Enzyme design. Structure first.
Site, PDB file in Angstrom:
ATOM      1  N   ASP A 118      45.193  48.942  37.182  1.00 55.43           N
ATOM      2  CA  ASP A 118      45.353  49.387  35.785  1.00 55.43           C
ATOM      3  C   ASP A 118      44.015  49.590  35.098  1.00 55.43           C
ATOM      4  O   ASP A 118      43.149  50.285  35.659  1.00 55.43           O
ATOM      5  CB  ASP A 118      46.290  48.370  35.109  1.00 55.43           C
ATOM      6  N   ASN A 145      45.900  45.738  31.598  1.00 55.25           N
ATOM      7  CA  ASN A 145      46.685  45.445  30.408  1.00 55.25           C
ATOM      8  C   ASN A 145      48.093  45.034  30.771  1.00 55.25           C
ATOM      9  O   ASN A 145      48.717  45.737  31.582  1.00 55.25           O
ATOM     10  CB  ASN A 145      46.754  46.694  29.520  1.00 55.25           C
ATOM     11  N   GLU A 197      48.177  50.716  41.794  1.00 46.55           N
ATOM     12  CA  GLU A 197      48.688  51.085  40.473  1.00 46.55           C
ATOM     13  C   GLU A 197      47.545  51.332  39.471  1.00 46.55           C
ATOM     14  O   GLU A 197      47.425  50.701  38.423  1.00 46.55           O
ATOM     15  CB  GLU A 197      49.704  50.047  40.002  1.00 46.55           C
TER      16      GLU A 197
END
Ligand SMILES: [Cl-]
Length: 292
Positions: free
Chosen positions: A103, A38, A127
């Site tokens: 993500d 996102n 991440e």
């Protein structure tokens, strides 16, 4: 850092809807499947793929409701994304893959790997989503932002009516300034406000402070899998990072089996926009030993 997207479009119809994807490189080996999150798209991978394409097939879908994919009126729960991506992978006839994930693409990728462990030959991640057991685990200066995102009134106002995820969060979590050409590539799927539903449901699905319970449980499950899996892992991290700060990357290096960590230098959340060439070159260098 390149701003163009020099990839021919490919489309596949799954579950009544067309999904767009990048598909380059040789067809006779193990493909590398790139999963954005996102509020991005395959555009996020544009400067990384060229390092990997010379040796391996690169497949980079736009998640349903995002990028150049179709935009059905869904709730865009995680479970919706799971249905579409599962169907995408089967429609392409993929057997074994290497995952490159970020993500929500990492929640999808780890969830798929947990369910299909013999089909995953390596995971490159950055991440990525893990449980945040309390708001204290959340990056301090973004707690207010995400608490407000995670509401039915203010969060919809900000993300859908005002496009805060695109205009705000996306450039905020890249250390270097995104250019207007890059911003226009990220804006294009979401020019119509109503089409921003996935951008709002995604932060509402994040496993934070025990909520929502279904996603906390599934994310806990894939992390337990990941901690016990011998699959090769390549973890990119930056400073100060965002949802994986340097100290967490170092803990993961020690706790995840067969894990190599790569310091990319400055970065927040969208590490691909700060150091795509190191991410791509390091993935390319790491792929050959996964074959046997
Ligand atoms: Cl999110």
């Amino acid at each position: 850092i390149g701003t163009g997207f020099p990839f021919d479009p490919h489309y596949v119809e799954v579950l009544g809807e067309r999904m767009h994807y990048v598909d380059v490189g040789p067809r006779d080996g193990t493909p590398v499947l790139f999963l954005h999150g996102n509020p991005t798209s395959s555009y996020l991978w544009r400067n990384i793929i060229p390092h990997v394409a010379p040796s391996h097939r690169c497949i980079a879908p736009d998640l349903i409701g995002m990028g150049k994919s179709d935009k059905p009126d869904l709730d865009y729960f995680f479970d919706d994304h799971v249905r579409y991506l599962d169907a995408f992978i089967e429609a392409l006839g993929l057997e074994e893959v290497v995952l490159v994930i970020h993500d929500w693409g990492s929640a999808l990728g780890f969830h798929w790997a947990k369910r299909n462990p013999e089909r995953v030959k390596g995971i490159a991640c950055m991440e990525f989503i893990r449980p945040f057991p309390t708001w204290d685990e959340w990056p301090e200066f973004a707690r207010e932002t995400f608490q407000a995102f995670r509401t039915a009134d203010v969060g919809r106002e900000l993300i859908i009516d005002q496009n805060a995820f695109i205009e705000g969060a996306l450039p905020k979590y890249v250390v270097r300034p995104l250019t207007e050409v890059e911003m226009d590539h990220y804006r294009e799927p979401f020019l119509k406000p109503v089409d921003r539903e996935p951008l709002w449901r995604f932060p509402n699905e994040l496993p934070i402070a025990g909520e929502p319970a279904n996603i906390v449980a599934l994310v806990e499950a894939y992390m337990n899998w990941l901690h016990q899996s011998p699959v090769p892992k390549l973890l990119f991290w930056g400073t100060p990072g965002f949802i994986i700060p340097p100290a967490e990357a170092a803990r993961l290096a020690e706790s995840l089996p067969n894990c190599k960590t790569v310091d990319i230098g400055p970065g927040l959340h969208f590490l691909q926009e700060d150091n795509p060439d190191l991410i791509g070159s390091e993935i390319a260098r790491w792929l050959p030993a996964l074959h046997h």
